[PDB]
Structures are given as structure tokens and as C-alpha cells.
Amino acid sequence: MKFTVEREHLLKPLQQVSPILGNLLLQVADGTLSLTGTDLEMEMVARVALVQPHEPGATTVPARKFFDICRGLPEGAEIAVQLEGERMLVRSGRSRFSLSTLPAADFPNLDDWQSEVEFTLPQATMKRLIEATQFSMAHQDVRYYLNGMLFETEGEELRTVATDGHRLAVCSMPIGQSLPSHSVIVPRKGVIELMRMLDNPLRVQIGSNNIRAHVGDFIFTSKLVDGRFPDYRRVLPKNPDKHLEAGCDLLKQAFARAAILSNEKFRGVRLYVSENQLKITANNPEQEEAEEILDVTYSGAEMEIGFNVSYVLDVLNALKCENVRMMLTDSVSSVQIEDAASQSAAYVVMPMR
Amino acid sequence: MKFTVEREHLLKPLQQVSGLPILGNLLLQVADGTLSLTGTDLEMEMVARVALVQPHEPGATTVPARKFFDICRGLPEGAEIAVQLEGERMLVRSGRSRFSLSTLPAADFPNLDDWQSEVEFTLPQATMKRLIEATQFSMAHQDVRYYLNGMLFETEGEELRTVATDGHRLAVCSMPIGQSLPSHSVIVPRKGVIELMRMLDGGDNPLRVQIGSNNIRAHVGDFIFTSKLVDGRFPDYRRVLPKNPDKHLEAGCDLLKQAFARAAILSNEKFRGVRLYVSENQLKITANNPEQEEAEEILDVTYSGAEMEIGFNVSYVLDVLNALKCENVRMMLTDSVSSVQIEDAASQSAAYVVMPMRL
Numbered sequence: 001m002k003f004t005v006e007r008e009h010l011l012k013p014l015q016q017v018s019p020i021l022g023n024l025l026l027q028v029a030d031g032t033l034s035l036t037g038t039d040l041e042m043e044m045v046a047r048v049a050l051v052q053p054h055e056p057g058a059t060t061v062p063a064r065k066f067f068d069i070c071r072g073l074p075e076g077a078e079i080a081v082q083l084e085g086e087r088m089l090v091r092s093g094r095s096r097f098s099l100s101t102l103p104a105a106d107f108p109n110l111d112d113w114q115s116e117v118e119f120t121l122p123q124a125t126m127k128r129l130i131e132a133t134q135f136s137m138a139h140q141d142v143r144y145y146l147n148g149m150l151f152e153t154e155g156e157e158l159r160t161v162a163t164d165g166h167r168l169a170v171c172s173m174p175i176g177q178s179l180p181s182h183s184v185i186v187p188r189k190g191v192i193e194l195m196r197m198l199d200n201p202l203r204v205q206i207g208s209n210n211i212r213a214h215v216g217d218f219i220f221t222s223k224l225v226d227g228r229f230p231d232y233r234r235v236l237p238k239n240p241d242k243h244l245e246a247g248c249d250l251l252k253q254a255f256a257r258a259a260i261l262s263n264e265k266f267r268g269v270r271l272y273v274s275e276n277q278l279k280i281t282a283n284n285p286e287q288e289e290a291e292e293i294l295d296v297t298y299s300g301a302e303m304e305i306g307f308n309v310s311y312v313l314d315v316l317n318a319l320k321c322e323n324v325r326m327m328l329t330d331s332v333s334s335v336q337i338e339d340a341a342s343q344s345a346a347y348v349v350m351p352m353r
Numbered sequence: 354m355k356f357t358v359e360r361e362h363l364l365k366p367l368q369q370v371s372g373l374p375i376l377g378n379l380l381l382q383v384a385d386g387t388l389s390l391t392g393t394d395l396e397m398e399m400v401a402r403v404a405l406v407q408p409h410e411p412g413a414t415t416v417p418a419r420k421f422f423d424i425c426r427g428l429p430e431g432a433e434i435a436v437q438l439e440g441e442r443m444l445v446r447s448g449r450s451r452f453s454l455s456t457l458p459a460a461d462f463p464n465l466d467d468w469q470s471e472v473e474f475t476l477p478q479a480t481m482k483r484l485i486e487a488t489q490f491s492m493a494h495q496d497v498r499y500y501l502n503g504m505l506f507e508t509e510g511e512e513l514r515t516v517a518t519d520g521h522r523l524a525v526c527s528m529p530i531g532q533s534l535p536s537h538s539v540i541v542p543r544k545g546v547i548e549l550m551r552m553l554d555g556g557d558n559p560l561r562v563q564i565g566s567n568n569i570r571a572h573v574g575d576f577i578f579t580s581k582l583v584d585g586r587f588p589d590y591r592r593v594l595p596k597n598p599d600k601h602l603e604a605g606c607d608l609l610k611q612a613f614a615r616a617a618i619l620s621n622e623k624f625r626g627v628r629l630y631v632s633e634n635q636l637k638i639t640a641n642n643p644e645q646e647e648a649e650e651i652l653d654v655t656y657s658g659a660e661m662e663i664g665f666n667v668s669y670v671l672d673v674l675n676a677l678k679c680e681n682v683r684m685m686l687t688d689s690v691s692s693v694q695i696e697d698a699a700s701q702s703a704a705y706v707v708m709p710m711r712l
């Protein structure tokens with residue numbers, strides 16, 4: 001196995017694919033160097049065209065070390081690689097490295113599988129879908145499926161849903177292709193890696209137990225998560241006909257200040273809603289108190305309601321909105337929150353006692 | 354106690370005075386047209402003064418530092434912040450944002466023991482910053498030898514010098530400050546060094562240093578820092594510097610740093626040994642590890658001495674090169690069983706000593 005490639009053609013591939021699970025599989029075959037990384041749950045494969053003389057073969061080398069060596073070399077460096085016995089030699093200028101290897105034959109593969117559902121979409125649309133909902137995924141819930149993210153196709157829409165039982169996020173985007181009605185749950189790490197590959201359209205293939213994403217010369221494949229993901233349609237309030245609208249940054253900063261004097265564990269704040277006014281209060285066991293009064297647009301009935309302020313702040317930070325709409329039902333029911341100018345994402349938060 | 358002040362006039366003071374429950378509070382005092390803010394951990398203290406141009410009323414209290422800081426930071430830029438005592442609480446009001454914080458009595462706020470100034474000098478802030486930045490990284494962290502967990506400040510003739518060592522590597526920096534000084538040295542605790550450094554912006558306000566038998570004080574503009582000294586004996590840096598090294602190599606700092614950084618990848622993770630082979634205008638760096646992986650770097654340098662080899666800890670050498678931020682570096686060599694002294698090729702102000710390794 002031999003190849004010579006420009007540093008700059010290796011960096012992003014090495015970054016994307018980065019005992020044998022600590023190694024990268026390198027394969028020179030036909031006109032291409034393939035680099036694969038895996039943790040047994042997911043894998044990333046990068047293809048790099050070899051325009052300089054090369055010789056076929058395969059090995060595995062330590063991922064971090066190989067990446068650090070390449071990125072540590074100067075801009076414009078040419079990197080010559082060749083397998084010598086059981087070592088992999090890396091040479092560039094008068095820099096030389098000899099890395100340990102493990103046999104390519106030992107590198108693990110995911111089980112073979114068939115594509116059942118397929119669609120293409122812009123990278124920007126996938127970024128939007130993930131960033132809109134990722135923060136609402138559970139962390140270490142015994143309901144393992146809540147620790148990942150639902151990807152649902154319905155009509156011509158792709159939708160993401162994330163929830164931890166206390167708050168929920170849902171985002172739907174049109175992708176202009178007739179889709180089957182189908183849903184899958186992508187594990188947390190898979191969502192992270194899928195986001196990290198978005199710098200070229202994205203081609204997605206979904207099987208019974210796997211999802212695959214093709215972007216440029218990268219292919220990401222992940223196992224899916226088993227389980228019954230809750231239906232967001234049963235979580236959206238049926239008729240939250242009290243509508244308050246407010247500036248997103250103004251509201252966020254008021255909540256952020258009140259939060260300072262909220263209970264450190266339970267983070268409770270109280271909202272008092274009245275004609276074109278919102279009052280936010282907070283208190284803690286030290287009997288310290290915060291109060292914020294804000295002008296809003298509200299012409300519904302007066303009510304009060306309590307929330308974990310972190311969940312509300314999380315939503316406002318995700319929206320990056322100009323104005324926000326809060327849609328209320330009563331003091332003991334969830335609230336729905338949206339960008340005042342877009343229905344494409346919605347957020348549901350439980351009240352506190 | 355009452356005052357009203359613009360948000361931004363509190364932020365820098367609050368940053369500076371922030372780091373037993375009352376140690377988590379700041380002392381606030383309104384007196385003779387000035388708000389004073391004090392933070393302390395019993396070892397050191399920072400006092401910040403803010404001039405009061407708006408109406409105020411005298412008095413003193415203490416308030417949770419982080420909460421008060423976070424409230425002030427969280428208010429909008431330019432906000433007017435009105436503060437008054439109300440019973441056992443401190444009220445903070447700005448626009449339609451209102452807060453009521455707990456207080457502890459000013460009478461319970463602890464003071465450092467009284468002391469007398471014995472040695473004093475004034476220098477530019479930039480000079481003190483240069484002296485501390487050049488050596489700070491070489492202080493010990495939580496060594497059993499408590500006197501190394503800090504920095505030596507030495508006056509001699511007309512110069513001020515800092516020394517820092519962890520028993521393995523050493524940094525020293527000396528700067529002339531244009532004042533006749535007594536020959537004196539003290540050890541400032543590492544947390545105090547860090548706090549002192551954070552107080553200096555390198556601006557046009559002069560820095561005044563006062564040293565007593567057991568304390569040091571630094572005054573710049575509206576800020577006064579006081580710390581206890583470490584009551585111990587510090588090592589003599591003159592005995593650590595390799596005596597009259599006979600060999601001198603000079604290289605580009607970034608090129609040398611990048612060569613060591615790449616070689617370090619395949620060095621022992623615990624002991625970090627790399628080997629140098631020096632020959633006419635050439636350096637070769639090698640590294641290997643227990644898995645028998647190997648790195649080699651060859652680069653052009655300026656060297657006309659005898660051929661020799663030496664090993665050292667590459668983490669310590671990288672620390673030096675990162676601290677120097679130099680165009681060119683000089684390595685002063687003797688042999689494979691002696692320490693190395695490293696300096697900026699164009700300044701003798703700072704020097705660094707790293708021990709040899711047999712690899």
C-alpha cells in the first residue's frame with residue numbers, strides 16, 4: 001500500500017472519520033484512498049481521489065496519532081505513506097513517522113442491510129432540523145429512545161422530534177419529494193456525527209435498523225434505536241388560545257436575570273400574564289427575590305403559570321427569533337412556544353406546581 | 354446606604370474583587386463620594402474604588418458576589434443600577450427589573466492583619482506583566498514543598514526579577530526599573546500571582562508595589578491588591594543555570610516548536626522524552642514510545658559547535674517555546690548530562706532551564 005497526497009486533501013477526511021476501534025482503516029483500491037472509522041454503532045467512510053502514483057492495499061493505524069501528525073505538518077505539505085512490514089511510514093519534507101498497525105482483516109464492519117426509504121435534501125435543511133430540536137433530547141433516560149432523535153417522513157416533509165418528558169421540540173421542513181409515512185430514532189452520537197458532516201446535497205437512505213447519509217465524498221452509517229417514540233401530535237396543546245407575543249431577546253434576558261434568584265435545583269419562575277404585560281418572578285430558599293416586568297402583546301384573560309426557567313431559556317436560545325409567541329391554556333397545562341413569524345418549529349414545556 | 358451607578362462602572366470592579374459564607378460576599382462601602390468594593394479569601398484581598406457622581410448615602414453591607422455580579426452583567430448595556438439597603442436585604446433596581454439580595458453585616462467582613470511597608474517601587478504595568486507572563490507557567494501547582502507554589506520577586510541594584518520553578522524546570526526574567534533598590538526577595542503565592550496578573554491591563558496608570566515582612570501590595574489606579582507572602586525559603590536560580598554553556602544553537606521559534614510538537618506525538622505519554630542530535634547547521638529530533646512507534650524531524654539551524662546529543666522532556670520545552678512567542682530562539686547546550694538554557698535569540702531578559710534525560 002502506497003499513496004502520496006496533499007495535506008489539505010487529508011485533513012477534513014481525517015477529522016470526519018476520527019484497541020482496533022481506535023484505528024482507522026485505510027484502503028488504496030482503484031483510484032481511491034478510503035478512510036473508515038467506527039465504534040461498532042456507527043461508521044464514517046471518506047473517499048479521496050489519488051491523482052499521484054499509488055499502490056493498492058489496506059491496513060489500520062491509530063486515528064488520533066495519524067490525524068495529529070497530518071494536521072501538525074505545514075500548509076502545503078505533501079504526505080507520502082507506505083506500509084513497510086507491520087509499520088506504516090509517513091513522510092513529508094524531512095519529517096518521518098513510523099506508526100503501529102493492526103490488520104485490515106480485523107477491522108469491524110456493520111451488518112449488511114437494505115435501503116427501504118430514500119430522499120435528498122439540502123445540507124442547510126438538515127442543519128435546521130437538528131439545531132431546532134437537539135437540545136430537547138433526554139440525557140441518560142431509562143427510556144433509551146428518548147436519548148436520541150426521531151426522524152419522521154410524512155407527505156413531503158421531514159420532521160425531527162426530541163423530548164425528555166418535561167419539554168419537547170418538533171421541527172418540520174418540506175423537501176419536495178413524495179415520501180412514505182415512516183419514522184426512525186437516531187442515537188445521540190449519530191445525531192452529533194450527522195451534524196458534524198454538514199459543512200453538496202445530502203442523500204439519506206433508511207433501512208429497518210440503519211440510517212445512511214451521503215454528503216460529497218463522505219458516507220455516514222448509524223444503527224437506529226428501538227422503541228416507541230412518543231407522538232408529538234398528542235403533546236401539542238389542543239386549543240392554547242391565549243396568545244402572548246414578545247421580543248425574543250428582551251424576553252430571554254428577563255428570564256435570564258430572574259433565573260439568578262431561582263431555586264438552584266428546581267429553577268422555578270412564575271409568570272403573571274395581563275393586558276399587554278408580563279411579570280416574571282423568582283425566589284429561592286434564601287428568600288431572595290427577582291421581578292421583571294415586560295411590555296408584550298396580549299389581549300386574553302389574565303392567568304399565572306410556573307415553569308423551569310432553564311427549559312424556557314433553552315427554547316428562546318434555539319429560536320434565535322425576532323419575536324416569540326407563547327400559547328397558553330391554563331395554570332396547570334403545558335405551554336406551546338413558537339417563532340411569531342414561523343410555524344416550522346414548535347416547543348412544548350410542562351408547567352411547574 | 355444608597356448609590357446609583359452605570360452598569361459598566363461596576364463590571365471591571367466586580368471582575369477584580371471576585372474570585373465561611375461571608376468570603377462569598379463582597380463588602381460594599383459608600384463613604385466620602387466613593388463606592389468601595391472588597392473581596393477576600395483571607396490570604397489575599399482586592400479593593401476597587403468607584404467614584405459616585407449621582408446622589409448617594411453612606412453605609413456598608415456585604416452581598417453575595419456571584420449573584421450581584423450576574424445581576425449587573427445581565428442588565429442591558431448602559432443600565433443605571435440603583436442600590437439601597439432595606440432591613441436585612443439589599444435592593445437592586447434598574448428599569449423594571451427589581452432584585453432583593455441577602456446580606457451579611459459589614460462588621461463581620463474579615464480584614465488582613467495590619468502591616469508596615471519596608472520596600473517600595475513604581476514601574477510600568479507592562480513591565481510587571483512581562484515579568485510574570487515570562488515565568489508563571491513554571492510555578493509548582495500543589496507541591497508538598499509549599500514554597501514552590503508561588504513566584505519569587507527579587508530586587509537587586511536597579512532590576513526586578515521573577516523566578517518560578519516546580520523542581521524540574523525553571524523560568525527567570527529580569528528587567529531594569531530605573532530605581533535604586535535594596536537587595537531583597539519574597540515569595541508570592543501562586544493564586545496571588547494569578548490575581549495580580551489579572552489586575553494589570555498594561556495601561557498608562559503606574560503600578561506601585563509595597564513589600565512588607567509578610568505581605569505584598571500592588572496599587573494601580575482604582576485597584577489595590579494585598580496578599581500574604583509564602584513564609585519559606587526559595588531556591589537560588591544562579592545555582593540552577595548551567596554554568597557557562599559552550600555550545601549555542603539558534604533556530605526559528607515556530608519551525609522548532611512545530612518540529613517538537615510533531616515529534617511529541619510519538620513520545621512516551623508519561624515521561625515525554627525526545628532526543629536531539631546537533632551537527633553543523635542541522636538539528637535532528639527523534640521520539641519513540643513503548644509501542645515502538647518512531648518520529649524523526651530534521652531542520653536547518655545555525656550551529657557551528659561540536660556534534661553532541663541530548664534528551665529532554667518535550668512538554669517542558671514546548672512550554673518554553675509557547676511562552677517565548679519569539680521570532681528566533683537560542684538553545685545553550687553543554688553536553689548530554691547537563692541542563693539546557695533556552696532564551697529568545699534577541700533578548701537575555703528571560704531564561705529557561707530544562708534538565709537532561711537519558712533516553
Ligand SMILES: CC(=O)N[C@@H](CC(C)C)C(=O)N[C@@H](Cc1ccccc1)C(=O)O
Binds near residue numbers: 235334
Ligand atoms: C409529564 C408529562 O405529562 N409530559 C408530557 C410531555 C411534555 C409536555 C413535553 C406528556 O405528554 N407525557 C406523556 C407522553 C410522553 C412520554 C415521553 C416523552 C414525552 C411525552 C407521558 O409521560 O407518558
Ligand SMILES: CC(=O)N[C@@H](CC(C)C)C(=O)N[C@@H](Cc1ccccc1)C(=O)O
Binds near residue numbers: 592593708
Ligand atoms: C531535580 C533537579 O535537580 N532539579 C534542579 C532544578 C531544575 C533544573 C529546574 C535543581 O537544581 N534542584 C535543586 C535546587 C532546587 C530545589 C527546588 C526547586 C528548584 C531547584 C534541588 O533539588 O535541591
Ligand SMILES: [Ca+2]
Binds near residue numbers: 004006051052
Ligand atoms: Ca493530492
Ligand SMILES: [Ca+2]
Binds near residue numbers: 647648
Ligand atoms: Ca523514522
Ligand SMILES: [Ca+2]
Ligand atoms: Ca414502494
Ligand SMILES: [Ca+2]
Binds near residue numbers: 290291451453
Ligand atoms: Ca422584588
Ligand SMILES: [Ca+2]
Binds near residue numbers: 171
Ligand atoms: Ca411543525
Ligand SMILES: [Ca+2]
Binds near residue numbers: 392393
Ligand atoms: Ca479576593
Ligand SMILES: [Ca+2]
Binds near residue numbers: 429430431432
Ligand atoms: Ca437598554
Ligand SMILES: [Ca+2]
Ligand atoms: Ca479598610
Ligand SMILES: [Ca+2]
Binds near residue numbers: 471472474534535
Ligand atoms: Ca525600597
Ligand SMILES: [Ca+2]
Binds near residue numbers: 510
Ligand atoms: Ca543584577
Ligand SMILES: [Ca+2]
Binds near residue numbers: 599686687691
Ligand atoms: Ca547547557
Ligand SMILES: [Ca+2]
Binds near residue numbers: 690
Ligand atoms: Ca557522565
Ligand SMILES: [Cl-]
Binds near residue numbers: 441455456457
Ligand atoms: Cl442575612
